[PDB]
Amino acid sequence: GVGISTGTFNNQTEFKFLENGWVYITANSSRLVHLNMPESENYRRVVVNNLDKTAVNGNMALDDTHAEIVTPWSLVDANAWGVWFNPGDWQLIVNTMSELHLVSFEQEIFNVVLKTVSESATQPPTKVYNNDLTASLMVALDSNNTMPFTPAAMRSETLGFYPWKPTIPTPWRYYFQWDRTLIPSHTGTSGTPTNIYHGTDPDDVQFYTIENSVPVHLLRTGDEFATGTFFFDCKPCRLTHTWQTNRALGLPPFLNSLPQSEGGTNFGYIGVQQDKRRGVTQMGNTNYITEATIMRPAEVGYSAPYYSFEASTQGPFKTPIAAGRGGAQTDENQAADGDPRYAFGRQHGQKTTTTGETPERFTYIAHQDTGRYPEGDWIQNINFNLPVTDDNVLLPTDPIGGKTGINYTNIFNTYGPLTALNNVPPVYPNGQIWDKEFDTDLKPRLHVNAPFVCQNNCPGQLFVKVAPNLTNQYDPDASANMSRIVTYSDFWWKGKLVFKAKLRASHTWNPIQQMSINVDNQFNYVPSNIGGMKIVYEKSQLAPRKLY
C-alpha cells in the first residue's frame, strides 16, 4: 500500500565456507536510484557526426561517426565489480582465494516513490514536491535478451559503488546500422582524404522498442518488482597469474660448474659448448642448443599488430589484443596496447569532492607475463649463420614501408596453433563481471572486457521509465511535444550476486604477494574530514601459479 514498505535494504557480503576448501560468496548490493522522466517520450534515430575532427589529417583515430537509437528508457546496470564488493571484501577474495566462479544473479525494485514538481510563478525560483500516489513506474525485464546488449561498464555508467550514496540509471540507447568510409592520412598528406557517411543499409535495419518486445510492469508506490534468480554457466576465473615465459618451460640445462661464493657477480656455467650440447630444437640446420633456440612444448602468449586500425562497413576500429605489453612491470611507462585504461567519474571511484569534467584514469598492469617485448624481437635468415650480418636480420629498428616510426613488429602476427594464453583478469572496481557471447557461428576464445562470458545467455537487461503523467491539455493530433506533469521517481534497487570460490593453498617455501594496507595507501580506503570517498583500483591475480 501507500504506507507499507515492500523490501529491505541489504548490502552485506557473506562468505559461507563449504567443505573441501570451497566458499559461497553472496554479495548483496542496495542502492537508492533516482530517475527523471525522459526528455522525450519518443524513439529518435540520431546520427552523431564529427567529420570536422577527422578532416584534420592524421586524426582518423578520433572518428566518432555513428548512428544510435535514443530511447525514452533508462538502463539499470550492476555489471561492475565495485557495485558488489568494497576494498575489504576484494582484499579477502584476492588474498585467500585461487579461483572464482559466477553462480547466480538476482535483482529487484522496491519502495517506489513518485513525486511531481510544482514550480511557482514567483520571480525568485521556488518549488514544491508532492507525492503522486497514483503515478506509475514502467519496469521491463528483457529476460529473453531480445534487445541489444549494451553493458554500461564500458562507458562507466553502472550503478554507484557506494551503498550510502544514491545513484542513477543511465539513459538507454543502442547502435543503428550505418555505412562509413574514412581513408587514413597523416600530417603532411596533400588533398582531402575520402571521408563520407553513406547512410544506412536497408537490409541491416533493426529498430527495437521496449514496448513491442518486452512485458512492462506498472509499479505504483505500493508495488515491487523481482526478476528472479538467474544461474550462470560460465567458466572458472583464475585469481592466480602465470609468470613462465617460453624461456622458463621444461628442464633447465645442467650446470657443470656452480658458483663457489655467493654474490651477484658469481654465475653458474653450463660448461658445454653451445654447439656440442644435447637436446632438441626445431632448427634443423643448426647445432647450437641455447636457451633461445631449444625446443619448448608450445608458445606462451602471441604477438599481434599493435595500434593497428581495421576498417569495415562502419569505419575504423582498433584491433584488440588479449595480453598486455611485456615490460610494463619493469617499466610502468611501457603500458600501452593490451593494458586496459579505465576512465571514470565520481560515482565509480573518483574522489567525490573533485570539481570539473576531467575523469579519474588508471592503466591496469596485469601480473601475468604473457605479454611481448617487441623491442627485443627480431627475424633472421633461415641459414642462421652467427653472428648475423646486416642483410640477414630484420630488427625492430628497421623501417617498414619507408617509415622510420614503423617496424615489422607493428605488423607482426605470431598467433598460431601453438599459442597458449590466459583470460583477462578481473579489474576492480571498474571492471565488468560478465559479458554476452557473440551470436556468430565461430566465437572468440575470450573477451577482453570481462572475465566471464555468457555461453547461452545471461540475465536480461533491466529498463526503467517514468510513465507519462499527462496534463489536462493533451492532444495526440498535435505535432508539438507531449505536455507532461514534471514527475520523477526514487526507488530502492537490491541485487544479489552469488559466486563460488576456492581457497588458495601454499605450494612453495616462500610467501606470495598479498594486497595490504600501508602508509602510502592508508587514506585511499577511508573518508576525508568532509566525507570525500574514493575507490582506487586493486589487482586480482596476485598469487603465482606454475604454467608447466
Epitope: 619493469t330 611507462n333 646486416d390 629498428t397 623501417p399 622510420t404
Partner: antibody, heavy 122, light 110 residues
C-alpha cells in the same frame, strides 16, 4: 606547451658541488626519459647524464661517472643534477633534455631548456 | 671511445640544397642509432630538427629532411633560407642508454 627551465647555475670553485634543478611543464613528467647535456664555452654539445624508466635508472658519461648524480622528483616535476668534485673542465652551459617517446623512446633530445651556465674557476 | 665526425663548416647559397653528414670513426650509422639533428643559433639553446633519423618535430619546416646515407646520417636542407644559418649538431644513440654528440657543423647561408 612543453617547457623546461633550468636553474642553479653559478660560479663555483674547483672541487665544489652544485645542484642544477630543471622544472618541466606542459607534459606528464614521470612518463618521459630526461637527461642533462652540456656545451663548453665555444665547444659542441656533450651528453652528460640520462634518467629513464619508471624505476629511474640512471646512466652517465665517462667524463662525469662517480662525480655526477642524476635524479628526478615526479611530484615536483623536477630533474636534479648534483655535481661533486667539480673541475675546470665542467664549466659550461647545461641543457635539460626531454625525450618525446614515452612508450617508444625517440632516443634523442625532443625538447631542450634554455640552459644554465656553470663556471668553475679558482 | 665513440667519436662522431661531421663537417666542421659548410656553406649553401639561398634557395640551394645542402647536406650535412654525421659518421662514426669506427663503425657505421644505422636507424638503430636513432640519429638526431639539432639546430643552435648564436646565444640560444639547441632546437630539435630531426629525431629517429626521419621525424621532424611539429613546426620544423619541410625543407629539413633526415635520412641514412651510406654508413652515416644525413640532414638535407633544400631551399635553404637565411634563418637556417646555425650550428647543426648530430646525436647518435650508442646502445644501452648512452648518447654521443658530433663535433657540429657551422652552416652559413651566403
Amino acid at each position: 606547451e612543453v617547457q623546461l627551465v633550468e636553474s642553479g647555475g653559478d660560479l663555483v670553485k674547483p672541487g665544489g658541488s652544485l645542484r642544477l634543478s630543471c622544472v618541466a611543464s606542459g607534459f606528464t613528467f614521470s612518463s618521459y626519459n630526461m637527461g642533462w647535456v652540456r656545451q663548453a664555452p665555444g665547444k659542441g654539445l656533450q651528453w652528460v647524464a640520462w634518467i629513464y624508466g619508471s624505476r629511474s635508472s640512471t646512466n652517465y658519461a665517462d667524463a662525469v661517472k662517480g662525480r655526477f648524480t642524476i635524479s628526478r622528483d615526479n611530484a615536483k616535476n623536477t630533474l636534479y643534477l648534483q655535481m661533486n668534485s667539480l673541475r675546470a673542465e665542467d664549466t659550461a652551459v647545461y641543457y635539460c633534455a626531454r625525450d618525446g617517446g614515452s612508450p617508444a623512446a625517440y632516443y634523442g633530445m625532443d625538447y631542450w631548456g634554455p640552459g644554465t651556465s656553470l663556471f668553475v674557476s679558482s | 671511445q665513440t667519436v662522431v665526425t661531421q663537417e666542421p663548416s659548410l656553406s649553401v647559397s639561398p634557395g640551394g640544397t645542402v647536406t650535412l653528414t654525421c659518421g662514426l670513426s669506427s663503425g657505421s650509422v644505422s636507424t638503430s642509432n636513432y640519429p638526431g639533428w639539432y639546430q643552435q643559433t648564436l646565444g640560444r639553446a639547441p632546437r630539435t630538427i630531426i629525431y629517429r633519423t626521419s621525424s621532424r618535430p611539429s613546426g620544423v619546416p619541410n625543407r629539413f629532411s633526415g635520412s641514412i646515407s651510406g654508413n652515416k646520417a644525413a640532414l638535407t636542407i633544400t631551399g635553404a633560407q637565411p634563418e637556417d644559418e646555425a650550428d647543426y649538431y648530430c646525436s647518435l644513440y650508442m646502445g644501452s642508454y648512452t648518447y654521443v654528440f658530433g663535433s657540429g657543423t657551422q652552416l652559413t647561408v651566403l
